[PDB]
Amino acid sequence: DCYHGDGQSYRGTSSTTTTGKKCQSWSSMTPHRHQKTPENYPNAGLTMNYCRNPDADKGPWCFTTDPSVRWEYCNLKKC
């Protein structure tokens, strides 16, 4: 599976970080509260806990379900 460019068009179902942690759902505020929601980023495709890049950083990322690690980049190769 892979992303093109900075991955803002990535709409795949990857949901694991580079260290093997599970992504938190974007509509969830636990374990991490955040403002990267569908309402604030309507074009980012923030559904379920899939790796996405709503704030146009270098590549897809996600908040993690580990209480101690707020967010990490996705386990996903560049195409």
Amino acid at 34: H
Contact indicator for 60, 10 with CB cutoff of 8 Å: yes
Q: How far apart are CA 76 and CA 10, in angstroms?
A: 10
Contact indicator for 23, 16 with CB cutoff of 8 Å: yes
Resolution, in Å, please? 1.7
Contact indicator for 79, 10 with CB cutoff of 8 Å: no
Q: What is the dihedral of CA 43, 44, 49, 51, to 10 degrees?
A: 160
Question: What are the binding residues?
Answer: 57, 70
- Give me the number of domains the chain comprises: 1
CATH number for the domain spanning 66: value is 2.40.20.10
Contact indicator for 15, 54 with CB cutoff of 8 Å: no
Q: Which two tokens stand for residue 16?
A: 């694991």
Q: How far apart are CA 20 and CA 6, in angstroms?
A: 21
Question: What are the binding residues for L-lysine?
Answer: 57, 70
Contact indicator for 52, 26 with CB cutoff of 8 Å: yes
Q: How far apart are CA 41 and CA 18, in angstroms?
A: 24
**Domain, as residue range, for 39:** 1-79
**51: burial class by Cβ within 10 Å (0-12, 13-18, 19+)?**
buried
Q: How far apart are CA 59 and CA 51, in angstroms?
A: 9
